[PDB]
Structure 1
Amino acid sequence: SEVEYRAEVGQNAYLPCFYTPAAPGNLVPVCWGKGACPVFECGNVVLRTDERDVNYWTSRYWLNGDFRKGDVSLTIENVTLADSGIYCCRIQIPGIMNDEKFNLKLVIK
């Protein structure tokens, strides 16, 4: 079968996502959203690293990796059954013409 990530209710979920940063160590940012990656964006935004982002410090969505170095892996804390589904991790470096799209499948039981 196909690639899966799992967590039990209450646990943290760890969904991997990487890209190659082309310096000067500036935020070439991520769109993390609920749903398979659509054509242009990243679905229902869960964490978007720009100026439109709101209430980061209170949400359950974390970039606890070395993201300036390209580790934009998501950690969702204290997961529920509702958190099951597909996540889109999209890297728009503008920058480069071809976006980096990743669908990550999370299963919660």
Structure 2
Amino acid sequence: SEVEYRAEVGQNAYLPCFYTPAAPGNLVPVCWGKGACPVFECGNVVLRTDERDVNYWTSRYWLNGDFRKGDVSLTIENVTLADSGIYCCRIQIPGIMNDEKFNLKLVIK
């Protein structure tokens, strides 16, 4: 057994990811992709934010939480078996190599 997130075909999938803004409104860029975080930046990119807003998304992928307070959890709508796999949520902390890397396993049946 290990940590995983689950959905049936047709449901939405919910993959958690959080950080804490250093001060209110001080956002840091976030990278969501399919594939483990050792791949490129955050895998095969599906969604990105910068210090101001979401700047990139792919159909069916959403940040529906309060991402301006650090809830950068992902929603995938209407999943198929092909959406199964590891996803990377990368918190791109400016000022060093110290990014926060989260790998989330999505199991679809």
Which TM-score bucket, shorter chain as reference?
0.7 to 0.9
Q: Deviations over 1:49-106 (max 9, x none)?
A: 1499999677110000111111000000000010000000000021454110000000
Sequence identity of aligned pairs in percent?
A: 100
Q: Distance in 1 between matches of 2:47 and 2:70?
A: 16
Greater percentage in strand: 2
Greater alpha carbon shift after TM alignment, 88-97 vs 71-80:
88-97
Q: Distance in 2 between matches of 1:55 and 1:22?
A: 21
Is the alpha carbon distance of 1:58 and 1:74 closer, same or farther for their aligned partners in structure 2, counting shifts above 3 Å?
A: closer
Q: Distance in 2 between matches of 1:79 and 1:55?
A: 23
Unaligned runs of 5+ in 1: none
Q: Distance in 2 between matches of 1:14 and 1:86?
A: 13
After the TM superposition, list the runs of 4 or more consecutive aligned residues in structure 1 that deviate by more than 3 angstroms. Answer: 50-58
Q: Distance in 2 between matches of 1:53 and 1:67?
A: 9
TM-score for the superposition, normalised by structure 2: 0.87
**How many residues are matched?**
109
Is the alpha carbon distance of 1:53 and 1:10 closer, same or farther for their aligned partners in structure 2, counting shifts above 3 Å?
A: farther
Structure 1 counterpart of 2:13: 13
Say whether the 8 Å CA contact 2:49–2:55 is kept in structure 1.
no
TM-score for the superposition, normalised by structure 1: 0.87
Say whether the 8 Å CA contact 2:85–2:105 is kept in structure 1.
yes
